[PDB]
Amino acid sequence: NPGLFTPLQLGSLSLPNRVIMAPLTRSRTPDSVPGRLQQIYYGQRASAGLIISEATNISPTARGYVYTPGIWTDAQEAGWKGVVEAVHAKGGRIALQLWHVGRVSHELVQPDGQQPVAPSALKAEGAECFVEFEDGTAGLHPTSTPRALETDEIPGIVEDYRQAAQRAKRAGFDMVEVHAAAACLPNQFLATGTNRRTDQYGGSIENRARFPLEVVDAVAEVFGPERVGIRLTPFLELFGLTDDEPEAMAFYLAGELDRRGLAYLHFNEPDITYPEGFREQMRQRFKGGLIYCGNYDAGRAQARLDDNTADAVAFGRPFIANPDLPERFRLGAALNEPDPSTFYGGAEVGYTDYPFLDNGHDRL
Amino acid sequence: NPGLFTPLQLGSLSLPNRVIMAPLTRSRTPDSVPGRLQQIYYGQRASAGLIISEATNISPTARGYVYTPGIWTDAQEAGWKGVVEAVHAKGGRIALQLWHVGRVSHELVQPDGQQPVAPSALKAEGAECFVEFEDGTAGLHPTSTPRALETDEIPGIVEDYRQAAQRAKRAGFDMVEVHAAAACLPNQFLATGTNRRTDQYGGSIENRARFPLEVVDAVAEVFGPERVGIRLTPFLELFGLTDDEPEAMAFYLAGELDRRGLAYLHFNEPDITYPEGFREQMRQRFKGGLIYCGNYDAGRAQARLDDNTADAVAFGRPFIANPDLPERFRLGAALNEPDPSTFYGGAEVGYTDYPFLDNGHDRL
Ligand SMILES: Cc1cc2nc3c(=O)[nH]c(=O)nc-3n(C[C@H](O)[C@H](O)[C@H](O)COP(=O)(O)O)c2cc1C
Ligand SMILES: Cc1cc2nc3c(=O)[nH]c(=O)nc-3n(C[C@H](O)[C@H](O)[C@H](O)COP(=O)(O)O)c2cc1C
């Protein structure tokens, strides 16, 4: 009968509470190197049961959005190490979210103007990425038509994830999260709509899943599976992705990742809603941690614990606006209101400046 | 090559950092029930790798000091549960320190004026406990002459610790620490000076250690050994205790507790100093966590990590005066100065009112 403040063993990691900070792209790293301002932003949120970092680009070609950080250079790794240490000195745990955008990119953000890469040469209809124009301004821009990866290029990409996991382990991260949730290369392999491949990487369920499962095994060699998670979005159809088989692939990956001993599966929820029985099935097929995310508040999060369908619940926008979110839940204190207009880009304002509760005792 | 901000697996508990909050009696619980003021005090220090609580009395007769909390009633357990939840909502881990004062007590603090209990009927020469006089004032007062426990009373005491561990597990504590360090019944059994027993609880090393090892096994049945620690003070001779064999008993207990799979041994240091080779021997005899405490600062704590003689270091007085101690170490920021005159008794002043660093961004 766990509450929100009942510690959870997530793989081999002890969490103090079940109020997780969702991965949140904030685009505050113009040079893609995290710095003192990240140390502050993540430090302020160190009370989270776990922090899952903003999506971080594993390579130059991995990028669809400028001002987002990387984990492919020595200078990036040292910046992240500064952030990780600061999360640790404030008592928290942080997982790095490993990102490849796939076809949700554009030649303008790509290095040397390279074409975006994907399972199949299909443009994401109506999708925008975020671009810095030649004149130094920046903005949303349509994604271009990608090239299909050659069957022989797939290992190089798996190696990019492996090497991002190696920099993560060295920088001190508690865990890694494979992003397969949205505007990402592994979800493109997974869905029928975006994957029209005829090599062993397309066709069947087992073929569509092979590339994502290799990425997972690659990062689990570095962290151990008991320190790896994955984010999935079955039933979602964002950035022009469509899928005919979201339930069967969810069941297959759950069984596959369950054998592997993965720490957790993390679902970003539909609200094209889940079928009845879906949550109960996931709980039976996967014995590790199940994290759900999508418009939760304290009572709805409790209900999923009571249901025995989640072990923990992640929160996005409320953690943007409340650095001491878990404490606000404990007290039933009113939440600060998020300001969508500073979600992305800029610097301290709408970032490190939403305030903590005043308990009447704490002094700075 | 761990630093102070390198996570540590302490038994089956993940710690974010190696800066531990030492157990600190503060005597702020007049009715012995923790309340909102403890929620605040321990919450403010939730960034500690682990918090070890003020010594808590396992029973009415366990007490030598008034205004210190207990863990023998339903109302005490609920107060502690409030504190533990608040530590969890601020992202920390807390261990309850289980206390029996033994002969460091007095009929005035005892219930119904009962004699203090001990291994042997020997007064602690020159020792003072803290007493509430009939007129409602309170102060230091000489300890009285205890009675020797009957051989048949020892299990009742072991059961008191077991039942305090059961209330601890139910209240949500991450771990328990057996206090055997100072002004406590298990250290009195251990030392030659205080233990002149001729039953199986005195004479040999193996007899002097039997009662303390039963307390440990009793609390390990409730928590699992991988969630239990013990605090020891070899070489110390406080509150009139003397010991002829501190090194041999330390080596014996280390081997005994090592077989048992205990999470950690926690030493409160001499400065009658340690023999050369003592730290290196402990490291070889005991494979779990070794915590040392006694006038540490950041650099001396680092040196013990570099030595491979400690896994973590605890801090007392600096955690009284600095709720964000680990962050101060990270930055090399100046520490607040402790005020010894509000170490004990009173309420918020010298308790919840030493301030955090101001980073220029955090707002209340
Ligand atoms: C500002 C913004 C940025 C986000 N960035 C990411 C991202 O980096 N990676 C990801 O997997 N999801 C991202 N998401 C989705 C969130 O992780 C979260 O799932 C979403 O906000 C829904 O949960 P919420 O209702 O509690 O905010 C983002 C959402 C928002 C609002
Ligand atoms: C205010 C005060 C209260 C203490 N209370 C306890 C106690 O409850 N239990 C215990 O084992 N040690 C207690 N100690 C010893 C501390 O846990 C710590 O070992 C001691 O202060 C030395 O470390 P330091 O130099 O960093 O403060 C106390 C020390 C002080 C200063």
PDB file of N, CA and C and ligand atoms in Angstrom, chain B residues 21-26 52-56 97 99 177 179-182 231 233 266-269 293-297 314-320 340 343-344, ligand 2:
ATOM      1  N   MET B  21      24.886  12.792   8.235  1.00  0.00           N
ATOM      2  CA  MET B  21      24.515  13.529   9.436  1.00  0.00           C
ATOM      3  C   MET B  21      24.575  12.594  10.649  1.00  0.00           C
ATOM      4  N   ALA B  22      25.520  12.883  11.538  1.00  0.00           N
ATOM      5  CA  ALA B  22      25.697  12.129  12.801  1.00  0.00           C
ATOM      6  C   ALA B  22      24.444  12.186  13.706  1.00  0.00           C
ATOM      7  N   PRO B  23      24.205  11.134  14.498  1.00  0.00           N
ATOM      8  CA  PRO B  23      23.176  11.210  15.527  1.00  0.00           C
ATOM      9  C   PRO B  23      23.431  12.397  16.520  1.00  0.00           C
ATOM     10  N   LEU B  24      22.415  13.238  16.736  1.00  0.00           N
ATOM     11  CA  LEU B  24      22.591  14.414  17.607  1.00  0.00           C
ATOM     12  C   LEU B  24      21.390  14.583  18.522  1.00  0.00           C
ATOM     13  N   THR B  25      21.534  14.172  19.773  1.00  0.00           N
ATOM     14  CA  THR B  25      20.581  14.485  20.815  1.00  0.00           C
ATOM     15  C   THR B  25      20.418  16.015  20.849  1.00  0.00           C
ATOM     16  N   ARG B  26      19.183  16.506  20.732  1.00  0.00           N
ATOM     17  CA  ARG B  26      18.870  17.959  20.796  1.00  0.00           C
ATOM     18  C   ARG B  26      17.810  18.293  21.845  1.00  0.00           C
ATOM     19  N   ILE B  52      21.272  10.182  10.455  1.00  0.00           N
ATOM     20  CA  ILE B  52      21.116   9.301  11.580  1.00  0.00           C
ATOM     21  C   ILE B  52      20.490  10.152  12.677  1.00  0.00           C
ATOM     22  N   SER B  53      19.352   9.688  13.223  1.00  0.00           N
ATOM     23  CA  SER B  53      18.520  10.494  14.111  1.00  0.00           C
ATOM     24  C   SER B  53      19.207  10.668  15.454  1.00  0.00           C
ATOM     25  N   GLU B  54      18.754  11.663  16.224  1.00  0.00           N
ATOM     26  CA  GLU B  54      19.086  11.768  17.623  1.00  0.00           C
ATOM     27  C   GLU B  54      18.828  10.397  18.254  1.00  0.00           C
ATOM     28  N   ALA B  55      19.649  10.002  19.232  1.00  0.00           N
ATOM     29  CA  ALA B  55      19.386   8.784  20.032  1.00  0.00           C
ATOM     30  C   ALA B  55      17.948   8.756  20.530  1.00  0.00           C
ATOM     31  N   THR B  56      17.238   7.677  20.259  1.00  0.00           N
ATOM     32  CA  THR B  56      15.839   7.575  20.684  1.00  0.00           C
ATOM     33  C   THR B  56      15.598   6.409  21.679  1.00  0.00           C
ATOM     34  N   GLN B  97      18.280   5.861  15.546  1.00  0.00           N
ATOM     35  CA  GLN B  97      19.282   5.377  16.478  1.00  0.00           C
ATOM     36  C   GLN B  97      18.605   4.865  17.769  1.00  0.00           C
ATOM     37  N   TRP B  99      18.353   3.534  21.490  1.00  0.00           N
ATOM     38  CA  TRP B  99      19.098   3.936  22.715  1.00  0.00           C
ATOM     39  C   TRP B  99      18.536   3.287  23.968  1.00  0.00           C
ATOM     40  N   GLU B 177      20.020   2.199  13.575  1.00  0.00           N
ATOM     41  CA  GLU B 177      21.357   2.142  14.124  1.00  0.00           C
ATOM     42  C   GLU B 177      21.288   1.727  15.625  1.00  0.00           C
ATOM     43  N   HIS B 179      22.843   1.904  18.972  1.00  0.00           N
ATOM     44  CA  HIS B 179      23.760   2.740  19.706  1.00  0.00           C
ATOM     45  C   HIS B 179      24.489   1.846  20.665  1.00  0.00           C
ATOM     46  N   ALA B 180      25.801   1.739  20.468  1.00  0.00           N
ATOM     47  CA  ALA B 180      26.699   1.124  21.447  1.00  0.00           C
ATOM     48  C   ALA B 180      27.907   2.017  21.653  1.00  0.00           C
ATOM     49  N   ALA B 181      27.735   3.318  21.420  1.00  0.00           N
ATOM     50  CA  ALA B 181      28.865   4.250  21.460  1.00  0.00           C
ATOM     51  C   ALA B 181      29.108   4.976  22.809  1.00  0.00           C
ATOM     52  N   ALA B 182      28.084   5.439  23.484  1.00  0.00           N
ATOM     53  CA  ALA B 182      28.415   6.196  24.696  1.00  0.00           C
ATOM     54  C   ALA B 182      27.192   6.531  25.508  1.00  0.00           C
ATOM     55  N   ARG B 231      26.784   1.730  16.025  1.00  0.00           N
ATOM     56  CA  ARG B 231      27.763   2.727  16.373  1.00  0.00           C
ATOM     57  C   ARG B 231      28.639   2.226  17.528  1.00  0.00           C
ATOM     58  N   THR B 233      32.421   2.816  19.917  1.00  0.00           N
ATOM     59  CA  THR B 233      33.499   3.755  20.248  1.00  0.00           C
ATOM     60  C   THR B 233      34.741   3.110  20.861  1.00  0.00           C
ATOM     61  N   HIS B 266      29.870   2.104  12.407  1.00  0.00           N
ATOM     62  CA  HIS B 266      30.033   3.545  12.499  1.00  0.00           C
ATOM     63  C   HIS B 266      30.883   3.869  13.761  1.00  0.00           C
ATOM     64  N   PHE B 267      32.095   4.402  13.587  1.00  0.00           N
ATOM     65  CA  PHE B 267      33.018   4.705  14.718  1.00  0.00           C
ATOM     66  C   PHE B 267      32.989   6.164  15.089  1.00  0.00           C
ATOM     67  N   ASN B 268      32.802   6.451  16.367  1.00  0.00           N
ATOM     68  CA  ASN B 268      32.977   7.827  16.805  1.00  0.00           C
ATOM     69  C   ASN B 268      34.388   7.879  17.353  1.00  0.00           C
ATOM     70  N   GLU B 269      35.216   8.680  16.723  1.00  0.00           N
ATOM     71  CA  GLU B 269      36.665   8.653  16.951  1.00  0.00           C
ATOM     72  C   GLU B 269      37.189   9.213  18.293  1.00  0.00           C
ATOM     73  N   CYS B 293      33.596   9.194  12.383  1.00  0.00           N
ATOM     74  CA  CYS B 293      33.111  10.493  12.802  1.00  0.00           C
ATOM     75  C   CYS B 293      34.030  11.074  13.845  1.00  0.00           C
ATOM     76  N   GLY B 294      34.229  12.390  13.818  1.00  0.00           N
ATOM     77  CA  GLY B 294      35.042  13.042  14.885  1.00  0.00           C
ATOM     78  C   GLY B 294      35.866  14.163  14.287  1.00  0.00           C
ATOM     79  N   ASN B 295      35.310  15.375  14.377  1.00  0.00           N
ATOM     80  CA  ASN B 295      36.005  16.581  13.937  1.00  0.00           C
ATOM     81  C   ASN B 295      36.426  16.613  12.491  1.00  0.00           C
ATOM     82  N   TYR B 296      35.645  15.958  11.610  1.00  0.00           N
ATOM     83  CA  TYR B 296      35.992  15.993  10.207  1.00  0.00           C
ATOM     84  C   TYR B 296      35.647  17.314   9.548  1.00  0.00           C
ATOM     85  N   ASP B 297      36.433  17.660   8.537  1.00  0.00           N
ATOM     86  CA  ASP B 297      36.027  18.678   7.571  1.00  0.00           C
ATOM     87  C   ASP B 297      36.147  18.058   6.187  1.00  0.00           C
ATOM     88  N   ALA B 314      30.782  10.886   8.803  1.00  0.00           N
ATOM     89  CA  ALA B 314      29.662  11.541   9.402  1.00  0.00           C
ATOM     90  C   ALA B 314      30.104  12.843  10.053  1.00  0.00           C
ATOM     91  N   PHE B 315      29.185  13.785  10.181  1.00  0.00           N
ATOM     92  CA  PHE B 315      29.540  15.091  10.761  1.00  0.00           C
ATOM     93  C   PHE B 315      28.489  15.475  11.750  1.00  0.00           C
ATOM     94  N   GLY B 316      28.897  15.970  12.925  1.00  0.00           N
ATOM     95  CA  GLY B 316      27.885  16.327  13.939  1.00  0.00           C
ATOM     96  C   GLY B 316      27.573  17.801  13.994  1.00  0.00           C
ATOM     97  N   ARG B 317      28.387  18.482  14.771  1.00  0.00           N
ATOM     98  CA  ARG B 317      28.234  19.919  15.006  1.00  0.00           C
ATOM     99  C   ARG B 317      28.154  20.730  13.699  1.00  0.00           C
ATOM    100  N   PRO B 318      28.986  20.416  12.674  1.00  0.00           N
ATOM    101  CA  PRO B 318      28.753  21.143  11.405  1.00  0.00           C
ATOM    102  C   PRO B 318      27.333  20.928  10.770  1.00  0.00           C
ATOM    103  N   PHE B 319      26.692  19.797  11.022  1.00  0.00           N
ATOM    104  CA  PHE B 319      25.293  19.606  10.528  1.00  0.00           C
ATOM    105  C   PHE B 319      24.240  20.283  11.419  1.00  0.00           C
ATOM    106  N   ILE B 320      24.602  20.550  12.683  1.00  0.00           N
ATOM    107  CA  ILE B 320      23.732  21.348  13.566  1.00  0.00           C
ATOM    108  C   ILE B 320      23.610  22.749  12.990  1.00  0.00           C
ATOM    109  N   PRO B 340      27.024  26.338  20.747  1.00  0.00           N
ATOM    110  CA  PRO B 340      26.855  25.312  21.808  1.00  0.00           C
ATOM    111  C   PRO B 340      25.761  25.591  22.832  1.00  0.00           C
ATOM    112  N   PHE B 343      22.537  23.886  21.701  1.00  0.00           N
ATOM    113  CA  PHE B 343      22.605  22.485  21.341  1.00  0.00           C
ATOM    114  C   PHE B 343      21.442  21.678  21.920  1.00  0.00           C
ATOM    115  N   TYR B 344      21.051  21.933  23.186  1.00  0.00           N
ATOM    116  CA  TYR B 344      20.036  21.148  23.920  1.00  0.00           C
ATOM    117  C   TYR B 344      18.850  21.930  24.460  1.00  0.00           C
TER     118      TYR B 344
HETATM  119  C1  LIG C   2      24.926  18.205  20.542  1.00  0.00           C
HETATM  120  C2  LIG C   2      25.535  16.821  20.641  1.00  0.00           C
HETATM  121  C3  LIG C   2      24.650  15.753  20.771  1.00  0.00           C
HETATM  122  C4  LIG C   2      25.056  14.477  20.462  1.00  0.00           C
HETATM  123  N1  LIG C   2      24.134  13.448  20.572  1.00  0.00           N
HETATM  124  C5  LIG C   2      24.585  12.158  20.249  1.00  0.00           C
HETATM  125  C6  LIG C   2      23.690  11.096  20.274  1.00  0.00           C
HETATM  126  O1  LIG C   2      22.479  11.308  20.322  1.00  0.00           O
HETATM  127  N2  LIG C   2      24.129   9.851  19.933  1.00  0.00           N
HETATM  128  C7  LIG C   2      25.437   9.612  19.557  1.00  0.00           C
HETATM  129  O2  LIG C   2      25.773   8.458  19.260  1.00  0.00           O
HETATM  130  N3  LIG C   2      26.350  10.655  19.518  1.00  0.00           N
HETATM  131  C8  LIG C   2      25.913  11.915  19.851  1.00  0.00           C
HETATM  132  N4  LIG C   2      26.815  12.940  19.768  1.00  0.00           N
HETATM  133  C9  LIG C   2      28.131  12.670  19.142  1.00  0.00           C
HETATM  134  C10 LIG C   2      27.928  13.033  17.641  1.00  0.00           C
HETATM  135  O3  LIG C   2      27.094  12.050  17.009  1.00  0.00           O
HETATM  136  C11 LIG C   2      29.294  13.234  16.966  1.00  0.00           C
HETATM  137  O4  LIG C   2      29.867  11.937  16.949  1.00  0.00           O
HETATM  138  C12 LIG C   2      30.255  14.243  17.713  1.00  0.00           C
HETATM  139  O5  LIG C   2      29.745  15.553  17.658  1.00  0.00           O
HETATM  140  C13 LIG C   2      31.641  14.353  17.062  1.00  0.00           C
HETATM  141  O6  LIG C   2      31.541  14.714  15.668  1.00  0.00           O
HETATM  142  P1  LIG C   2      31.618  16.232  15.177  1.00  0.00           P
HETATM  143  O7  LIG C   2      33.002  16.679  15.525  1.00  0.00           O
HETATM  144  O8  LIG C   2      31.583  16.379  13.657  1.00  0.00           O
HETATM  145  O9  LIG C   2      30.447  17.008  15.847  1.00  0.00           O
HETATM  146  C14 LIG C   2      26.393  14.226  20.072  1.00  0.00           C
HETATM  147  C15 LIG C   2      27.281  15.272  19.966  1.00  0.00           C
HETATM  148  C16 LIG C   2      26.858  16.571  20.270  1.00  0.00           C
HETATM  149  C17 LIG C   2      27.797  17.682  19.916  1.00  0.00           C
END
